[PDB]
Symmetry: none
């Protein structure tokens, strides 16, 4: 399955280029381990805050591109964790 | 787009493209310091494709050497009392 490892006080981002009107879906779940939640942010090509979620253990967020361009999906670890947070996720386009 | 870059800060923008796609950058420093900025464009393999030091403006086109996300970064390495303001456009072919 798809996942990302996020070190303490770090952000890991993923990118998709899509056309206006395209459905985009994020699903995520923090993996098994010592940590329960993650910060998530989705931003559009002109820095629109599409989604911002703090301290979420899991989530589903579906939206439609409002313009052509690159969309940014970011996971942030805001704590001084001794090991990185692991988060399972998928980004579905169309 | 206008972006403010504080003293000793960096601001990056990202475009995901396919190999061979043309990518245009136009930029001009509008305000701050000596009206100069450092520019770095880096590919998804961490291969830098453009580095400009202390540039006041530029217009360039690049061809992506591989699929993935390219990072366009503006860095202000002066201890300016004001931030640099850069006006820029990234065009993707």
């Amino acid at each position: 399955g798809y996942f990302v490892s996020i070190d303490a006080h770090a952000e890991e981002c993923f990118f998709e280029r899509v056309t206006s009107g395209t459905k985009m879906g994020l699903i995520f779940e923090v993996a098994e381990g010592g940590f329960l939640d993650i910060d998530v942010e989705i931003t559009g090509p002109d820095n629109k805050g599409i989604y911002k979620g703090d301290r979420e253990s899991s989530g589903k967020y579906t939206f439609a591109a409002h313009m052509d361009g690159t969309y940014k999906f970011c996971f942030s670890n805001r704590m001084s964790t001794m090991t990185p947070k692991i988060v399972m996720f998928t980004i579905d386009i169309g």
